Amino acid sequence: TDANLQEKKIFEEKQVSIFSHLDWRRRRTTENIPKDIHPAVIRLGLKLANYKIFGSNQRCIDLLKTFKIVIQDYQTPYGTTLSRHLTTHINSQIAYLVSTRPLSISMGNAIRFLKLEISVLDIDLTDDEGKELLLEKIDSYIRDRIIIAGQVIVQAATEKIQDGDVILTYLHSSTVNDVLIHAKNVGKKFRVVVVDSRPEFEGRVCLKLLTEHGIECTYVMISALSYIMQEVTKIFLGGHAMLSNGALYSRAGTSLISLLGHESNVPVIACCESYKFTERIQLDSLVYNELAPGDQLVNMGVDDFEEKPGVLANWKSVKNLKLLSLKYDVTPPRLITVCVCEMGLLPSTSVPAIINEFKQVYA
Amino acid sequence: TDANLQEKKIFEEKQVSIFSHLDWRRRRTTENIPKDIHPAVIRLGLKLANYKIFGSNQRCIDLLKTFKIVIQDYQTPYGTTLSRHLTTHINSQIAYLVSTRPLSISMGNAIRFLKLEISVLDIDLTDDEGKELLLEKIDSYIRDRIIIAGQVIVQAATEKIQDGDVILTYLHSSTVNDVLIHAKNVGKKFRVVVVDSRPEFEGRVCLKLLTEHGIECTYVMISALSYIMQEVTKIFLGGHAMLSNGALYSRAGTSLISLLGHESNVPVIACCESYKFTERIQLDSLVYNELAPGDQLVNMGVDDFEEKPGVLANWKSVKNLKLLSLKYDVTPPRLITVCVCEMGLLPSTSVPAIINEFKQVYA
Amino acid sequence: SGSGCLMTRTLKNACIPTCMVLDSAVSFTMNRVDLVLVGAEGVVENGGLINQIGTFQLAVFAKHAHKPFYAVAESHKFVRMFPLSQYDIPFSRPILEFDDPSPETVHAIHNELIMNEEQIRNNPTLDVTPPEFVSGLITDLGIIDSKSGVSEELIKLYL
Amino acid sequence: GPISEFMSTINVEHTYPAVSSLIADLKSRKVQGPFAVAVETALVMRQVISQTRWSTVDQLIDTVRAVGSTLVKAQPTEFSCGNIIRRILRLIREEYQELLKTADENEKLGGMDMRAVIISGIQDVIDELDKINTDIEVQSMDHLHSNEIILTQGCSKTVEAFLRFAAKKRKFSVIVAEGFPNNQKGSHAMAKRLAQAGIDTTVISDATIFAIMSRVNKVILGTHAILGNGGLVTYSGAQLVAQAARHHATPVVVCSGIYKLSPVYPYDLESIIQLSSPDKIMSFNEGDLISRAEILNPYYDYIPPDLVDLFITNLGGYPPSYLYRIMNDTYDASDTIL
Amino acid sequence: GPISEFMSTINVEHTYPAVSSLIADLKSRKVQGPFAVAVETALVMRQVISQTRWSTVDQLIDTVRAVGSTLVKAQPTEFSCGNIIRRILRLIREEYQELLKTADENEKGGMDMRAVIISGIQDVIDELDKINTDIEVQSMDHLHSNEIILTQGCSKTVEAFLRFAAKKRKFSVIVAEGFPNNQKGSHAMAKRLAQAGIDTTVISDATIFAIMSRVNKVILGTHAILGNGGLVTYSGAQLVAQAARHHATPVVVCSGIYKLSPVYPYDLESIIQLSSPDKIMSFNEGDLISRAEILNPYYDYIPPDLVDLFITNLGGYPPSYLYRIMNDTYDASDTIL
């Protein structure tokens, strides 16, 4: 690329706008693509930028079982051995795989794990030797950290549900959906509240899923929160990641949900999985975030961009007027009453210890 | 004043710095004063910029006592009666005075009052008839509005003092001193805490006064508030003005006193006088305020006049470096427990109604 | 429980000044206190507190009156329970139920018109202090203020 | 005491035609919003006074104090209606008592044809309303300052003209949370207008409020009405702004007219908030859903008065603990209920 | 159990001369500050181990567990000393235990681990001359351009913290001269970073509330941290804390970890020392100094529930995680000396 130039503009993008630093640059096409790139990565790469309702957790899976194929189809050159070169190959994958959409925390941590096990294997094992354990090491990483922990959480989460509750979710969290779905099958008596928001109404698909199991549900937009919260008794939240201070990191309205719940004295239950935890720490919801294109706001009506001649459609060419839409915010711990990880129901502030319970397992 | 394109220069003084708008322009010397300036006004204008400890009350008094001399020495241009022309003369006195120090609230309200009585004055009188009248009105103002109100506040103030108390004042409020000395003269058994602060340690003179009446007094700078407040049981503050929202407007360190007092459960008592109430309001202590030259804190050490220099003597010519010192800051009303006006003990939020009692049932 | 009188004597019996306070007027006394100290009848995961009813009644005052709050707990009182709110705790009998007044007709130190044993039973015997109000939790393991180390030490107990 | 007991149905339509004509448009929401209600509610009574027969004065107040009870029974939530009425009741009894004393001014010891002044008194308040935005926007320069970051919601025209005034001389930035789903259209228009006014305006989703409040100086708001307790009956999604602002120690500022002030007390909110059609929320097409779920869409939010920090009025800026004094100087406690 | 109950003063002065020398310089403030206390403490203990005769490790434990109790009796408030000690004690018992296990290979004398302990001590020394470098890095993950920072009283750790970010990003900072004690140093700091191209604004120690309205973050460098996460900071720092809490402005602390200590703040009146009143009132007002009560606190205390994030030579962590550093850095027995 332009190299330091395009890497100096970024550090010039530091001025008045409190979003001057948020990386807007994307690649939604395979135009001018490099050749160091495996096909299945590209499909995944196009999946990220174009899928909308996807990837609270499914990315890490879809990334890993894709990674297997990469290493499977990989073969080391005759000169150097395997571990001396594999990372550089994978490093060239993620670089592309970033310009499609910035990494999640669930993905980033897994990558940080994979690069480790690469550097620790013994050289005696040959290619067909070295590959075979990685898949198991990966297939285990999937079953141990993701799926099982899910089933553990779903059990533990459904545990503290009581017959007669009225519980509230917000924008289709595949984890929390599995909870309510599991809750119905055990015969728990309750009903659910679904809060949707603009732009891409990620919540209606949760309405579909829940209704296809016969669940008394209620669909109201976020701006009506002050109303419906009186009905609610419990609040469940599936997060993108939890922070070292104990803050919950999820999509835009995740804060207001926790806020009014507190000021209405209902609990905020954060269902998140352990590997999503991060030693990262941030105070305001603007230091580290990820942007969605503001064009999607032009859609005035209740559908994805289609027959929506918004009066803003020319904002890209109207000075002093620029739209935006974060898709992640930072909710402080004072509102979160509890996080439920496969290590059990823990106080959100108890996160960073759990991370330290891994560096012991890993040397 | 080249013109009021220098006021356009003020319109350019709205830049990044929070204090860009705060007026720094002063005239602390009689260089090139205009002709139409009364001598006894000059002395005051000099007293303004150079005096310290200039109590907000005494200024209003010394202003009025000076104003009488202006009118008493005033003679209208005959053929044009008094009321038609008096204001512009006086209006040319204020415009000078403000260039020595911006008008206190204790003065501006008096200004807006006298200018009123000028307009309402009966034309069918003559000069020696007219000027003699408002002199009594001025004297009546000083009798009713301040001295009596002062004499009422103190009595009502010391009423709520209890034997065994520990009083805390800060930076010499002539009213606050006036009530403290009364407390000793009625045999009230107590002791006083005196908080001082940089730069011009206005609190020493409060210590001087109280000591010359023999009171168990305690002198500590404000950066020890966390310590001393445990001993304190009541707090008394004399304000520069009280806002219609209920906020108290006094010297820069007034807020932390009330804050630390609240978080230590001591009451905050605002002894202020009615004529120092204002219809305006402030959310930040920066929008409406007045400054002091930053040089005055260059002198490190315990003295002010004494030529003990510092490491910042070049700050005027060191870019990205600037010293400042606001003289006043607001104080949110929820920290003020009571305000002591001559209308009695009132909650600070009841201020704006009292102002209406003046606007209404009068003219 | 009326356990105050027992606590009163046992202190007075050890030559220290006492002054009983009815549970209705603790707040009026807070400004006079310098420290608040209560026992523990049970400790949950989140740092909460299970003690005799009215324990939370105090800690809110100490909070609002800006006075510290300490609770003494022995290690063997920790429990795996994790109540969400300040209410969801397993309780035997039904609690705080009402009546059904059909249309009929059945009929300052007033010291003898007190709630009968029956209607007293309808009251709960335990309240719960959330961890935000426990400035300090003292145990045989030491003093624990984190209310996350409460859990780490807890996990260290349940093998 | 509604009029239906005093006067029947058809007779009202013959002597007071616009009344029953209005009530139709008032329940059918042909006329809605506070301003549009007030102006119409006024000139209706103009014709009423211009076409009524009466002798004394207690009978006259008993008439207007009766039609209003119905005229507010149509759509009570639009408090702008009754507010015009309660002020009118004082307008005559202040006029009556004022002229009752010019009689005994020198009298040594009738009651009609004072309509034109009452009409002129009525006509006055109408001229005041077309002024309301004008004598409010001038208060902006006492607060808004350059480089400051502002957040508002919806499309309150009063708040619009408020900012644009400062925008002419000083330049700064604002943040527009679209009042989804109801205040959507107007919000976008306002933002586009704010741009041409030279404001670094940024349109955000309704849910991005908490994210940017961390670096927001002040928040400005324009309600739909203010109740007796100082509570705000505002368009949808405002409690999000308030709670997020308070949680960030951000000062809340309300720039409302005074006619939207009403002393009715918020006994129960469930009888206050209204709900438009769910069409504004979920498309009619998703037929499986609308049958299997309960869908609601309100456009009224309520915020308790202990949240706001300042009101901007055509009279001036005043703290919430002072609104009562405006009431007794504008209404009469006899006319609280109707 | 002080050393006097184990060795006599002359013997202490003979075999361990630098100890009594340091004890003198301690109670007399010849040495001062947390850092300078720490470095000199270990250097003393280095020579101690370098010049001592013993056999068992249990007796060696009892020795260091005694001098410290005496060394901490000198000027306890400078907790930096005792923190170094308890670190060594664990550094022994775990080094002993790790060497008690290699010898248990199949055997189923026991000393002269000297130079290792010295090599372990030197590892502590070289670790300290580094905290700033280890801390000034995490800046770029918080401070951004056009941000507004408030900070009081010439904390060296905080200085290099900002100056690092100021090399690449440009932003503003408000400095409140920690009057009266931190006066001189604070002005120097302001003057220093002023040259580092960062908008510097020196204020009175009292205008804190006025500007907190438009302050993004606040940053503080303490003198010590106690077992409950409380902060023992230099004079006049509770204001800015309480000023921040009232404005929802977050509070961050950039401190090395050696200042952390598990002493529990039972009574603060036994913690906050008091310096000379000369620093706030001249000797001249003889009428006043005889007629009133003058006090000048050296330190200030803020409770942990006001801190929002810590910055350490290890990383950023919330206060609730602090304990898990102590158990990973100290041993529970060595809380009380």
Peptide bond into E180 cis (omega under 30): yes
**Nearest chain C alpha carbon to A235:** C84
For E324, the closest chain A residue by CA position comes to A353
Superfamily (CATH) of domain C1-157: Translation initiation factor eif-2b; domain 2 (3.40.50.10470)
Interface contact flag, B244 D319, Cβ < 8 Å: yes
Residues of chain E with Cβ-Cβ distance to B227 below 8 Å are 272, 295, 297, 300
A211 → closest Cβ in D199, D215, D293: D293
Amino acid at C68: P
- Which residues of chain E does C151 touch, with a Cβ-Cβ cutoff of 8 Å? none
The answer to whether D292 and D106 have CB atoms below 8 angstroms apart is no
To which residue do tokens 């980033």 refer?
A108
Contact in structure between D5 and D73 (CB atoms under 8 Å): no
**How far apart are alpha carbons A112 and A275 in whole angstroms?**
11
Of A204, A222, A224, the CB nearest to D298: A224
Chain B residues with CB-CB distance to C65 below 8 A: 265
Q: How far is A9 from chain E (nearest CA, A)?
A: 13
Q: Which of D200, D214, D239 sits opposite A320 (nearest CB)?
A: D200
All partners of chain A with 3 or more CB pairs under 8 angstroms: C, D, E
Cis peptide before C131 (omega within 30 of 0): no
Sheet bearing C136-139, strands edge to edge = C36-38, C69-72, C136-139, C142-144
d(CA A134, CA C88) in angstroms, rounded, equals 46
Q: Which of D147, D169, D310 sits opposite B245 (nearest CB)?
A: D310
User: What is chain B's length?
Assistant: 363
D271 in contact with A, Cβ within 8 Å = no
Experimental technique used to determine this entry: X-ray
CA distance D248 to D210: 9
Residues 6+ apart with CB under 8 A from A322: A294, A315, D202
- Asked if D164 and D172 count as a contact pair (C-beta separation under 8 A), the reply is no
What is the C-alpha separation between B83 and E312, in angstroms, rounded? 73
Cβ atoms within 10 Å, residue C7: 12
C65/B263 touch (CB, cutoff 8 Å), yes or no: no
Min Cα–Cα distance to chain D from E145, Å: 13
User: How far is B137 from B120, CA to CA, in rounded Å?
Assistant: 13
d(CA A222, CA A170): 9
The pairs formed by E36-40 with CB atoms below 8 angstroms and a separation of 24 or more are E37/E78, E37/E80, E37/E81, E38/E80, E38/E81, E38/E83, E38/E84, E38/E128, E38/E258, E39/E125, E39/E128
> What is the nearest CA distance from A267 to chain C, expressed in angstroms?
7
Per the CB < 8 Å rule, is E236 touching B224?
yes
Rounded (10°) angle between helices A58-73 and A86-99: 140
The dihedral over CA atoms of B260, B263, B266, B269, expressed in degrees to the nearest 10, equals 60
Contacts 24+ apart (CB under 8 A), D272-278: D272/D77, D272/D233, D272/D300, D272/D302, D273/A227, D273/D298, D273/D300, D273/D301, D273/D302, D274/D77, D274/D298, D274/D299, D274/D300, D275/D299, D276/D182
- D188/A311 touch (CB, cutoff 8 Å), yes or no: yes
At E174 the three-state DSSP class reads: strand
Chain D: residue whose CA lies nearest to E148: D215
Check residue C42 and report its DSSP letter. B
What does the block give as tokens for D7?
A: 């006067």
Contact: A198, D180; criterion CB under 8 Å:
yes
Residues contacting E211, CB < 8 A, separation 6+: B18, B286, E150, E174, E203
Give the CA diameter of chain E: 81
Tell me whether residue A173 is exposed, middle or buried, using C-beta atoms within 10 angstroms of its C-beta: 0 to 12, 13 to 18, 19 or more: buried
Angstrom distance (rounded) from CA A148 to CA E3: 57
Which three-class secondary structure state does DSSP give residue B199?
coil
| CA of D129 vs chain E CAs: smallest distance (Å) | 36
How far apart are the C-alpha atoms of D23 and D78, rounded to whole Å? Answer: 12
SS3 B358: helix
C-alpha span between A38 and A72 (Å, rounded) = 11
**Quick count: other Cβ atoms within 10 Å of Cβ A137?**
14
Give the whole-angstrom CA distance, residue E3 versus residue E62: 9
Find, among B239, B309, B275, the residue nearest to B63 by Cα: B275
Amino acid present at B34: P
Residue of E137, E143, E320 to mutate when probing chain A, most A C-beta within 10 A: E320
A234/A166 Cα distance (integer angstroms): 6
Given a contact cutoff of 8 angstroms between Cβ atoms, the answer to whether D233 and D227 are in contact is yes
CA distances in angstroms from B40 to B29, B51, B67, E318, listed in the order given: 15, 16, 9, 64
Give resolution in angstroms. Answer: 3.5
Q: Give DSSP secondary structure letters for E38-63.
A: HHHHHHHHHHHHHT-----HHHHHHH
Structure tokens at A46: 């196009």
State the residue for tokens 């230099």.
E234
Question: Residue A183: how many CB atoms within 10 A of its CB?
Answer: 22
Q: Where chain C is broken, by preceding residue (C–N > 2.5 Å)?
A: 107
| Number of CB atoms found within 10 A of residue A233's CB | 17
Q: Which residues of E touch D215 (CB under 8 A)?
A: 216
Instruction: Residue C66: list chain B partners with CB under 8 A.
Output: 263-265
Query: B244: which chain D residues are within 8 Å (Cβ-Cβ)?
Result: 317-319, 322
Contact B291, B22 (CB under 8 A): yes
Q: Does any CB of chain A come closer than 8 Å to the CB of residue D198?
A: yes
Selected residue of E149, E214, E245 to mutate for chain D interface (largest D Cβ count, 10 A):
E214
Residue-by-residue DSSP string for A78-132: SSS-STTTHHHHHHHHHHHHHHTS---HHHHHHHHHHHHHHHHS-TTS-HHHHHH
Do the Cβ atoms of A48 and A59 come closer than 8 Å?
A: yes
For residue B263, the chain C residues in CB contact (below 8 A) are: 66
E–D touching, 3+ CB–CB pairs within 8 Å: yes
Give the number of B-D residue pairs with CB atoms closer than 8 Å.
46
Q: At D91, list the tokens.
A: 């307008």
Whose structure tokens read 């870019």?
B319
How far is A92 from chain C, CA to nearest CA, in Å? 41
Interface test with D, best of B11, B12, B14, B18 (most D CBs within 10 A): B14
Question: Count of alpha carbons within 13 Å of B325, Cβ hemisphere only?
Answer: 18
Distance CA A327, CA B5 (A): 48
- Residue C145, chain E, CB below 8 Å: the answer is yes
Closest CB to C147: pick one of A162, A347, A353.
A347
| Tokens matching residue B52 | 């310290």
By the 8 A CB rule, do D258 and A274 touch? no
**B-side interface with D, Cβ within 8 Å?**
11, 14-16, 20-21, 244-246, 279-281, 283, 287, 333, 349-350, 352-353, 356
C: neighbours with 3+ CB pairs under 8 Å? A, B, E
Contact status of A294 with chain C (Cβ, < 8 Å): no
Q: What is d(CA A190, CA A178) in angstroms, rounded to the nearest whole number?
A: 15
B257: which 2 tokens?
């006193």
- Of the candidates A246, A284, A353, the beta carbon closest to that of E324 is on A353
E334 contacts chain B (CB < 8 A): no
E306 has a chain B CB within 8 A of its CB = no
Q: How many helices (H) and strands (E) does chain A have?
A: 13, 10
Distance from CA of B305 to the nearest CA of D (A): 37
> Phi and psi of E20, rounded to 5°?
-55, -35
**From E142, E144, E168, residue closest to A21, measured CB to CB:** E144
